[PDB]
Amino acid sequence: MDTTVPTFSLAELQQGLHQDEFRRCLRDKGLFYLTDCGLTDTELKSAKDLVIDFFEHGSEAEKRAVTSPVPTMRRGFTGLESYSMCYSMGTADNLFPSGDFERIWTQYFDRQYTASRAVAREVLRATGTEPDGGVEAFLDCEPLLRFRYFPQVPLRMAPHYDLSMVTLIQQTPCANGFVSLQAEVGGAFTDLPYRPDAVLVFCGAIATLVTGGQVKAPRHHVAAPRRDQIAGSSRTSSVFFLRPNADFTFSVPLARECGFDVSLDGETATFQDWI
Ligand SMILES: CC1=C(C(=O)O)N2C(=O)[C@@H](NC(=O)CCC[C@@H](N)C(=O)O)[C@H]2SC1
Ligand SMILES: [Fe+3]
């Protein structure tokens, strides 16, 4: 039936405006684009620009000394060695190629994090939800950002819900129109392109959980291009996962009620256990 994906100014929402629509969008299709939340395509494009700079012009040497040590616990670069390169950050223990990089990308992270907190904060106020220990404690959490860059100019994974409170995507488009990102919206698969001055927001499982089921975490997937769509497909994505502190808590009879792969037992549980 209904597949459209709505847009909102965060400033306007904070001014009480559009209350019902925003409420229903959460509960029935857990996603949306978002203007006026103190992110800018310029900031994004300046960050992108210096990573690709390093991709292209760094020695074997500087890379090695800041490529991922533990390959799966996640800080630094991957997939740059002689299809997808990828940079990761967090609150700390980060790895940086130069001094100026550190600044630009530390600020880029902060701005992201602040925005993430804001929208999240709004998501709670809107469901009249007030987490155990406080809205702020909860929002002071252990977040993670992953940037991807697909350069140069066929297996199909299954959709997933994100293991997050909210997730913010900023993407750059392909020179040829192809959208990698799609989601289940009222029965169907809707494209999720780059929109100018906007930023995409998935609600995540944690959102659903903390609001006592009031908010939907949409299943989404990231397609590759068919072996004929390859020319003009360089793209990037900036994906900021707003993950809680290890010790957040949730009643497991509530959890499975929304179709969540949890092979653990007992009374309630915690975020650390689950990942
Ligand atoms: C959303 C998203 C993206 C992405 O590039 O956008 N990718 C990342 O940053 C990724 N994170 C990982 O590599 C873990 C893989 C998750 C899943 N395959 C599993 O272990 O059972 C993926 S999965 C999450
Ligand atoms: Fe995802």
Cα dihedral sign, 123-127-133-135: positive
Question: What phi and psi, each to the nearest 5 degrees, are found at residue 87?
Answer: -110, 135
Give kind and range of the element (H or E) at residue 239: strand 235-241
Residue 81 three-state SS: coil
C-alpha dihedral (106, 205, 271, 79), degrees to nearest 10:
-50
The answer to whether the beta carbons of residues 17 and 44 sit under 8 Å apart is no
Strand extents, DSSP E, 140-199: 144-150, 166-172, 181-185, 188-191
In ligand 1, the atom with minimum distance to the C-alpha of 222 is: 6
The answer to whether the beta carbons of residues 34 and 25 sit under 8 Å apart is no
64 is catalytic: no
Closest Cα partner for 139 from 161, 118, 125? 118
Experimentally determined by: X-ray
Catalytic residue among 74, 75, 121, 146: 74
Q: HSE-up of 213 (CA within 13 Å, CB side)?
A: 10
CA-to-CA distance for 162 and 146, rounded, in angstroms?
A: 13
Token readout for 102 is: 């550190």
Instruction: Please list all protein residues whose beta carbon sits less than 5 angstroms from ligand 2, which is an ion.
Output: 162
Q: Residue 183 class from Cβ within 10 Å (0-12 exposed, 13-18 middle, 19+ buried)?
A: buried
Among protein residues, the one whose CA lies closest to atom 17 of ligand 1: 160
Query: Radius of gyration (Cα) for the chain, nearest Å?
Result: 19
Pairing relation of β-strands 188-191 and 181-185? antiparallel
Strand extents, DSSP E, 80-210: 85-89, 144-150, 166-172, 181-185, 188-191, 200-203
The answer to whether the beta carbons of residues 21 and 6 sit under 8 Å apart is yes
Q: Which residues pair with 189 in a beta bridge?
A: 184
This structure's resolution (angstroms)? 3.0
User: Is residue 163 within 6 Å of ligand 1 at its C-beta?
Assistant: no
What domains, with CATH codes, occur in the chain?
1-275 (2.60.120.330)
The answer to whether the beta carbons of residues 240 and 225 sit under 8 Å apart is no
Chain CA centroid to CA 15, Å: 25
In residues, how long is the chain? 275
Q: Which residues pair with 35 in a beta bridge?
A: 9
Pocket test for ligand 1, best of 147, 169, 239, 263 (most atoms within 8 A of CB): 239
**Where does 127-231 have alpha helices with state H?**
135-139, 205-210
Q: HSE-up of 87 (CA within 13 Å, CB side)?
A: 26
**Could you identify the residue written with the tokens 């992270």?**
109
Residue 34 three-state SS: strand
Q: Which residues pair with 250 in a beta bridge?
A: 269
Chain CA centroid to CA 246, Å: 18
Token readout for 223 is: 């397609």
Question: What phi and psi, each to the nearest 5 degrees, are found at residue 71?
Answer: -60, -20
Ligand 1 centre to CA of 224 (Å) is 14
Among protein residues, the one whose CA lies closest to atom 14 of ligand 1: 72
